[PDB]
């Protein structure tokens, strides 16, 4: 359960969606005023992505 915002900063360098093993979209709620995006990489590292960036919007729109 999301108790506060997870992402203070976001990874800005675009990359190919093939390296994303898990995509997590968290809608704004009582504990965070903004939509947040967390992707999990092959290594298991969790990365914050900017939902306001077009390249991120495209990875979500074509993720299936």
């Amino acid at each position: 359960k999301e108790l506060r915002c997870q992402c203070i900063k976001t990874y800005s360098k675009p990359f190919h969606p093939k390296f994303i093993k898990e995509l997590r979209v968290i809608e704004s709620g009582p504990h965070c005023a903004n939509t947040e995006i967390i992707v999990k990489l092959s290594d298991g590292r969790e990365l914050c992505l900017d939902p306001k960036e077009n390249w991120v919007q495209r990875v979500v729109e074509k993720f299936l």
């Epitope: 108790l3 506060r4 915002c5 997870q6 992402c7 203070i8 900063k9 976001t10 990874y11 504990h31 965070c32 005023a33 903004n34 967390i38 590292r45 969790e46 990365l47 914050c48």
Partner: antibody
């Protein structure tokens, strides 16, 4: 010199608005949340909300959401808190405080607020 | 909402004595409980973070511990500058909540 420098004391009339600033220096501005905590005379500490210095996306305490606005200026590493519809009960020392460092790798183990500004006294009086 | 209850409201101790300050959380806050010191006319100052973790520049006499919703700040031996108000503060969830404070005063 790691600092959080706040604007000077303010004297406002009931119903008026106040805008307090907090300028960050000597550290990576974007790595720390900036919280606003107030202390009414002889009382405890009360969280008003915070803001991410990157997004400029602010989180408020439900108690003040209708009357408070938090903004930031990355160019000048300054955070602002605007409190509206002032009443006698808003008379307090308003502090800004930093919590971090954090990056684009999320965590569930947090730091405390390690650096606080000197506080700004806001007096609400006729 | 999260309510942090500090006890006692006032600790009256002599310098050199051990100070034991308690903080009780209404619900679980994991270990995201931090300790602050506040002196008159000054901003609060972080002592211990994440229940028991050490803060740079803070004397070794300060230590924190926590069992579930129960947290403790210990000052092993009170120094004259340690007589102040102490607050516990949670940030496991927003809004951040602070306890009502414990005043550590000189016993005479």
């Amino acid at each position: 010199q790691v600092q959080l420098v706040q604007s000077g004391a303010e004297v406002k009339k009931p119903g008026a608005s106040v805008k307090v600033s907090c300028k960050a220096s000597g550290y990576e501005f974007t790595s720390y949340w900036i919280h606003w905590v107030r202390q009414a005379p002889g009382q405890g500490l009360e969280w008003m909300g915070n803001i991410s210095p990157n997004s400029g996306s602010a989180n408020y305490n439900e108690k003040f959401k209708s009357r408070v606005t938090m903004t930031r200026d990355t160019s000048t590493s300054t955070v602002y808190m605007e409190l509206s519809s002032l009443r006698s009960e808003d008379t307090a020392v308003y502090y800004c405080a930093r919590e971090g460092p954090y990056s684009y790798y999320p965590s569930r183990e947090y730091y405390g607020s390690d650096l606080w500004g000197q506080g700004t006294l806001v007096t609400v009086s006729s | 909402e999260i309510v942090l209850t500090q006890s006692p409201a006032t600790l009256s101790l002599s310098p050199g004595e051990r100070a034991t300050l308690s903080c009780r959380a209404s619900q679980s806050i994991s270990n995201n409980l931090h300790w602050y010191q506040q002196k008159p006319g000054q901003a609060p100052r972080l002592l211990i973070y994440y229940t028991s973790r050490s803060v740079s520049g803070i004397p070794a006499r300060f230590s924190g511990s926590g069992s579930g919703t129960d947290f403790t700040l210990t000052i092993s031996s009170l120094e004259p500058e340690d007589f102040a108000v102490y607050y516990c503060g949670q940030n496991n969830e927003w809004p951040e909540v602070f306890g009502g404070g414990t005043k550590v005063e000189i016993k005479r």
